[PDB]
Design a protein around this ligand. Structure first.
Ligand code: GGL
Ligand code: GGL
Ligand code: GGL
Ligand code: GGL
Lengths: 236, 236, 236, 236
């Protein structure tokens, strides 16, 4: 890429957020934590009204479907996942629509899957779709196709690579990257950097400066864009 | 198949409706005709509460997106389709959710495309999804993937074939199938039968008794299921 | 008023529709008939896009709440209306919002009750609200306050009187007004005119030309505005 | 009442929250802050799933309408509040419905105004409505009638009085009640206690133990119910 130090990260013109499946779902995998989700939608809409062109990759659509049913799964578990995923995708897109249009923005559910990034025709089609959507002041929300799926991070890295984004914020649960497992002497967190780690290395080789923050920390995106020593930063 | 005469069509246990792109969109391709759409949703929900297991194939999602934007396309046509398709898919699934839950039913947007019916892994996945959704008392709504698309009828025929449905109602604009173009002497409509025609022949060879009704006719599905001489009927 | 013959009714600049409680609720009082409701919303939105300034008075909000619960009333009828009315008002306003914004219009739920038309302060406030809403290209939907209520037709007449509307369409179930009960010789329907009848006489004395159509008849509003001999017409 | 010390507040069986007009609207009066609103909805739904019977009094409905229009007010401010209030009430009830049903709860918009608490017939009707709604496992949301209105706190006090609630949480912006204006020596915050102050004294005389917390403090309700020295507590 071109970015080297965290001080430069105020000049990134195309973010790609990626809400991890452990940030937005409450501590059961049986709900949808509204606190962190509303905070992250607030930060993303505010950052998009600032002039950048964000593009979320929302994970965790099975949880909304599980909680929306909560009855037909119960009455069937005594007489007897993808169905929950489908129903949840629909309902979650509705809820995102509400909580985003509460800031003036519009959204547009784009559904892809990892095989769609391998053939050239589908890659061309998807890039054309995303560019026509970005040029219209819309925030695409790129979920994974649930009905053709056997933690959507490699997908986010590859998507940032194709669209060639400046940043790639990768929210998660762990505070960052340590030097050794936490149950050890010398758990020195490595802010800079000489699964998530592999995808970050990939996106680094493809011209993308990955950053791995902590989801539960208040005002995460607005902080990491500014330059505070938060999260993790991958660059030679 | 097994069905021969229209009198037998009261014993079909798995319908596959298919709302044509000229039935639900008002006469501009710039809106969404609520009259026919509400009538067809009413008939389908009533038929599903009767014991059958319907599965719509709703076309015309670009119209809802076009009308929902109506401003950002305007202001851009002076300074300068898939984007409209995406936004419309989201909004239309929301509207279907409302107008179906007004009858007690639940729906679940399933998004496929014609290449998903060629590989074996995706076909297995999709069939498992649809069976897990049918066994849960849900009405799947199978739109075509807009973001990986370069009048969704061949798709409906192939989908009915894979799930192996008894009937396949194929709503449209024309009253049926004539003997010659209308501007000719002897336009004898052929109810029985010794694009739509080709797909119907295909689905006939694959064990599906296709039927082509007229959309604007009031109470179409409830009539054709009963046995009245409406629409068209394909069987040797 | 000023209108005398049905030919003049093309120059009315302020309609007040009133959907009767027997037109939109399906034939159980336990649902919400989507066919007639969608047709009437289509006609009203089309008439409003024509330059007039309509203002619906939607009845039947208890039905939507009854059907939306359908479970918590059931499980309680073995261990043991206004609650259904409240929940239904909310859900029905949401559904109207969807099916109206599908034509570009916006709506704004205004909740009044008959005692609000007797004191002068509340009458002034309500008139100011309605005029500020009409001058903004919005279609107010004037339901009756359910939580302060012990077939909302007198309300519609009085509302048309205060706002001083040219027309007052009063949709209902009966085709019109007969000369005698139907089980009699000589059931001559009286189109012109030298409960509903009393409210119509009132609104006639207050400068409003009431018209009573049949709800189930297709394209009712567009017909009666044109001048066809449909419904009933009250004028000396 | 019966409660004296904050240690006893774990045994209150009927809360009445009241979200102040400065907690949920972002710092413009031109939006709807999703962070605090989602946090408060999360806390209230969690407290209601605990066995209590909460009943919100959501303020700030004009902000949602202002932001939802944002265009028709703009284009009219060059050619030229209650309208915004009406549109906002509708949209905000929809958003609350979504963010509450994401926890399993159902809600039911109840619209009252201060004159509805003075006549006996309307008071009886409203109490019957609220009791029939509480006995159904529903969370009523008691906004003030905007179309018959010339910071809804006296309303909340009187409502808690009529329903005779154990607690009355009154969220706001100020951390509590000080001994003197902040620009003075000796700004000793008074947790216990020997506008908001007047309403609290009233509700104390009517058998209600008022509590005034700080909205922006994370996990406010769950804390104050527990017994931590937060907010303010009114009791002799
Ligand atoms: N269902 C997908 C995730 C879809 C989503 O992004 O919500 C999975 O389990 O991998
Ligand atoms: N956009 C697709 C149709 C999608 C739909 O079914 O709505 C097409 O034009 O073929
Ligand atoms: N609940 C009211 C009618 C309210 C409405 O207009 O829906 C009644 O029964 O009179
Ligand atoms: N519009 C009312 C408040 C209504 C509400 O609770 O949102 C007022 O300004 O007093």
């Amino acid at each position: 890429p071109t970015f080297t130090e965290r001080s430069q990260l105020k000049y990134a013109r195309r973010l790609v957020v990626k809400l991890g499946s452990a940030v937005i779902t409450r501590e059961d995998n049986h709900g949808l934590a509204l606190g962190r989700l509303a905070s992250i939608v607030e930060q993303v809409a505010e950052c998009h009204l600032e002039g950048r062109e964000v593009m979320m990759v929302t994970s965790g659509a099975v949880a909304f479907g599980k909680q929306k049913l909560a009855q037909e799964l119960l009455m069937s578990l005594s007489m007897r996942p993808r169905a929950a995923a489908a129903v949840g995708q629909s309902g979650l897109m509705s809820l995102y629509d509400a909580m985003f249009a509460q800031y003036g923005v519009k959204i547009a559910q784009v559904l892809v899957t990892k095989p769609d990034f391998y053939n050239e025709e589908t890659r061309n089609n998807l890039f054309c779709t995303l560019s026509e959507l970005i040029s219209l002041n819309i925030v695409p929300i790129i979920n994974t196709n649930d009905a053709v799926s056997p933690d959507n991070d490699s997908l986010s890295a590859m998507l940032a690579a194709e669209v060639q984004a400046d940043l790639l914020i990768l929210m998660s649960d762990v505070d960052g990257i340590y030097n050794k497992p936490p149950w050890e002497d010398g758990a020195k967190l490595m802010h800079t950097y000489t699964s998530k780690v592999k995808a970050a290395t990939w996106a680094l080789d493809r011209g993308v400066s990955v950053v791995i923050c902590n989801g539960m920390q208040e005002k995460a995106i607005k902080t990491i864009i500014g330059g505070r020593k938060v999260g993790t930063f991958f660059t030679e």
